[PDB]
Structure formats: structure tokens, C-alpha cells
Amino acid sequence: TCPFYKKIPGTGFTVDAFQYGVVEGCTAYFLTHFHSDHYAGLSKHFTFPVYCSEITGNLLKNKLHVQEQYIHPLPLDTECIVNGVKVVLLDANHCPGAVMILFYLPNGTVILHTGDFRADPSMERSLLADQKVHMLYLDTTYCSPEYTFPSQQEVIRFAINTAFEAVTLNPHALVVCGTYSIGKEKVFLAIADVLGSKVGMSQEKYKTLQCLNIPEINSLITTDMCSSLVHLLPMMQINFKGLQSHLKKCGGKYNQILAFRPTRIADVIPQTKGNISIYGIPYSEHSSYLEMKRFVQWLKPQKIIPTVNVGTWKSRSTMEKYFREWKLEAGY
Ligand SMILES: CC1(C)[C@H]2CC=C(CN3CCC[C@@H]3CO)[C@@H]1C2
Numbered sequence: 001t002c003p004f005y006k007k008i009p010g011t012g013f014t015v016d017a018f019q020y021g022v023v024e025g026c027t028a029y030f031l032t033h034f035h036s037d038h039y040a041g042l043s044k045h046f047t048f049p050v051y052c053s054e055i056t057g058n059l060l061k062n063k064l065h066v067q068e069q070y071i072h073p074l075p076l077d078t079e080c081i082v083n084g085v086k087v088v089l090l091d092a093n094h095c096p097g098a099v100m101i102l103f104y105l106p107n108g109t110v111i112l113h114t115g116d117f118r119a120d121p122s123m124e125r126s127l128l129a130d131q132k133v134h135m136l137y138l139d140t141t142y143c144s145p146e147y148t149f150p151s152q153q154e155v156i157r158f159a160i161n162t163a164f165e166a167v168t169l170n171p172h173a174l175v176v177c178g179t180y181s182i183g184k185e186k187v188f189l190a191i192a193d194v195l196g197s198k199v200g201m202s203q204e205k206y207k208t209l210q211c212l213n214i215p216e217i218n219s220l221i222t223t224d225m226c227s228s229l230v231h232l233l234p235m236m237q238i239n240f241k242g243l244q245s246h247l248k249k250c251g252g253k254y255n256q257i258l259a260f261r262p263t264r265i266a267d268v269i270p271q272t273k274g275n276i277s278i279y280g281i282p283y284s285e286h287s288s289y290l291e292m293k294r295f296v297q298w299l300k301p302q303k304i305i306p307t308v309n310v311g312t313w314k315s316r317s318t319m320e321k322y323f324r325e326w327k328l329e330a331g332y
């Protein structure tokens with residue numbers, strides 16, 4: 001059955017709740033972003049209203065074939081009325097089109113649902129700051145202090161420098177980048193830009209990227225693999241066997257592969273077999289522990305409801321202990 005943490009009390013709304021059939025009482029289904037665990041169950045035969053960002057709506061139409069009449073895109077940073085309730089969509093700093101949702105309940109309660117997010121201090125300057133928020137439905141993916149990661153900018157600097165050095169030393173090296181969902185496009189776009197190349201990919205991945213409203217996208221990507229020295233492959237193919245196989249297909253154009261898997265940064269080393277090297281780089285689209293803690297201590301919610309790691313009693317207890325520490329430290 002549909003879990004409590006996907007229902008919005010005092011409304012006919014659910015969030016990311018498409019795998020449970022017709023949810024009794026639901027007059028509007030919100031979708032925070034186009035990742036498969038969240039859209040699970042949506043298909044071309046869905047016949048209820050779906051509320052989402054413009055980008056998410058482009059993907060629903062073109063990739064899942066949801067009929068146009070059921071797709072309700074909303075602009076960001078704008079007060080909108082849906083089935084008699086004021087809502088705002090905010091940028092989640094996750095993947096393209098990903099949003100947080102602010103609900104202004106008829107009874108005066110205000111609820112924030114983060115969807116999946118990477119907390120940032122810039123979130124402290126939006127409509128979020130204009131009123132008190134009582135309940136927070138929180139992306140707790142990395143809610144433990146061992147989760148430190150570098151800034152996205154630091155990780156991209158490492159990738160650009162690594163690729164440029166390798167290809168300047170050997171002009172016959174190919175760069176390959178793994179993907180299995182939308183998100184983390186900066187990794188392959190930044191590398192291709194330093195190398196003066198478009199990014200080559202399958203027709204299916206090209207279609208997906210053409211839905212994302214990226215400026216000047218036609219100048220950056222292509223389906224002509226032969227013209228490109230940065231290729232995208234499915235994440236499952238980023239291993240010595242898959243990459244050896246890909247090199248054979250390039251017809252003797254290349255004699256080395258440098259590959260990236262976007263799972264201290266200065267000290268990161270690759271796995272190497274012969275003329276193939278694979279780098280795992282810590283590019284995150286979710287909050288680190290410290291980023292999450294800063295956001296929650298600024299927001300000062302009355303109640304937090306985790307939406308990730310909820311399946312075990314140990315995980316639930318661990319998260320509850322951190323929420324109480326944070327509250328006692330900051331005095332709310
Ligand atoms: C974020 C979490 C609340 C859930 C997922 C991962 C966690 C961190 N791990 C690494 C070692 C200690 C602990 C158990 O796997 C916490 C349990």
C-alpha cells in the first residue's frame with residue numbers, strides 16, 4: 001500500500017506515488033523528477049492529472065508517452081493554485097527538471113517536500129524564506145557524518161584536467177563517460193568542451209537530452225560517433241570487457257580509452273588494464289551530511305519525515321538521533 005510519507009495530509013495530493021494503482025482520495029499526482037524509482041508505474045495508459053516541471057513534462061510525453069491532456073507543467077518560483085490549494089515549485093539542485101514542492105494547506109500549515117535534492121545556501125533566498133515551514137519531507141539519502149563529498153565544481157575541475165592531459169599526451173585516446181539516467185550531464189559536457197568536441201551517443205540517449213532545455217544543446221551533442229572524441233555508453237558497459245569491445249568497434253581510430261564512472265579528490269587513481277583506465281569520480285546530486293544539517297538548522301521545521309532509508313528500524317533510529325542533535329544544538 002502507499003506509504004504515509006508519500007501522502008500530503010489535508011489534501012487530495014500524493015508525491016511520487018505512481019506504483020500503487022488508483023490511490024483512494026487522490027485528485028492530483030505530483031512528480032518531483034524523472035528518475036525511475038520515483039516515476040515507477042507511470043506509462044502511456046495513465047489517466048489522472050500529473051503536476052510537474054516543464055522539463056519533467058517533456059520527458060513524460062516523449063519517453064513514457066503519457067498523453068498530453070494529463071500533463072500539467074508549472075513554472076518555478078511562482079504561486080499557483082491547484083484544486084483549490086496554493087503550491088510553489090522550487091529548484092531542487094538534483095537532475096534537470098527536479099523540484100521541491102511547497103504546499104500551503106487550507107488550515108494554515110505549510111509543508112515542504114524536497115523530492116531528491118542537494119541542499120545549497122542559495123535555497124535560503126527563495127519563496128522558502130517568506131514564511132514558517134511546519135513539516136519537512138526530507139531526502140535523507142546520505143544522513144550520516146561519514147558522507148563528505150567535494151563540491152561539484154572541484155570534481156569537474158579534476159575531470160577536465162585529467163582528460164585534457166591524457167588526450168594532449170596521446171591524440172589517439174578516446175574518452176568514454178557512463179550514464180543510466182538523467183543527471184550529472186556537466187561531467188561529459190565539460191570534458192567535451194575542453195577537448196573541442198561534441199559528445200557522441202545513441203539515438204535513445206540523444207532523444208532524452210533533447211527534452212532537457214539545455215541552452216545551445218545542438219552545438220554540444222551528436223549521434224555521429226565517428227565525429228566525436230567523447231562517447232557516452234550505458235553505465236553497465238563501463239568495465240574492461242565492455243570498453244575493449246567498444247574500442248574494437250571504432251575501426252582502429254583509437255588505441256587507448258580513458259573512462260569515467262560518476263558514482264581526497266587530488267589523490268584519486270584509476271583502475272587500469274593495458275590501454276584502458278577507469279576513474280570513479282564522486283559527483284553527487286544529493287546533499288552531503290553537512291549540507292543537509294545546515295539546511296535543516298536554517299529552516300527550523302517542527303516535524304521531519306524522512307523519505308529515504310525508511311525500511312529498517314536501525315536506519316530510522318539513526319536518523320531520528322541526528323534530527324534531535326541538530327534541534328538541541330540550534331535551539332528550535
Ligand atoms: C544514511 C544512513 C542513515 C543509512 C544508509 C547508510 C548509512 C551509513 N552506514 C555506513 C556505516 C554505518 C551505516 C550502516 O551501513 C546510514 C544507514
Ligand code: NI
Nearest residue numbers: 033035094116
Ligand atoms: Ni533522483
